[PDB]
């Protein structure tokens, strides 16, 4: 299963039509920053395809 | 207040076998990844495998040829069948999952307490 392909899952906001996006902040869900830190109430904005 | 839980260790030579036992409660429902960890003394907790939401597994380079991860069909209780033990196992593993709060089903991460192996 080819794994290169990716999407944005995580964003703070919808797109608004034609913008394009391919910022690479981990997404916080907590109310806590993340601070370039993966794991407790922070997620990666991308996922990828089997 | 028992989220998760780690058993199935013991007191065996390298090169013995047994089984661990990861029982996760409702983690089918909740979905959130898995991973088995350990800890050596003296030194901080080191990865050992991951397991994720779709069944794919991955080991560490210490580990791989000889780990076995696998996730029940039903009834969480994942399991690290451990084969061909060498001296560098002695280590304490645990667990780790997320589990629902504000409503988000995995914002709450939560470590079991684990369990020692002394490889002889």
């Known amino acids: 299963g080819n794994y290169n392909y990716l999407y944005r899952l995580f964003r703070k906001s919808n797109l608004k039509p034609f913008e394009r996006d391919i910022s690479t902040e981990i997404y916080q869900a907590g109310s806590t920053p993340c601070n370039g830190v993966e794991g407790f109430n922070c997620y990666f904005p991308l996922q990828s395809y089997g | 207040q028992v989220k998760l839980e780690e058993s199935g260790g013991g007191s065996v030579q390298a090169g013995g076998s047994l089984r661990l036992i990861c029982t996760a409660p409702g983690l089918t429902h909740n979905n959130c990844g898995l991973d088995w960890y350990r800890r050596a003394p003296g030194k901080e907790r080191e990865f050992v495998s991951s397991?994720?939401?779709?069944?794919?597994?991955s080991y560490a380079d210490s580990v791989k040829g000889r780990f076995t991860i696998s996730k029940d069909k039903v009834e969480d209780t994942v399991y690290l069948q451990m084969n061909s033990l060498k001296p560098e196992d002695t280590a304490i593993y645990s667990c780790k999952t997320a589990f629902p709060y504000f409503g988000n089903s995995c914002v709450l991460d939560y470590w079991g307490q684990g369990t020692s192996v002394t490889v002889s």
């Open positions: 397991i994720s939401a779709d069944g794919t597994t």
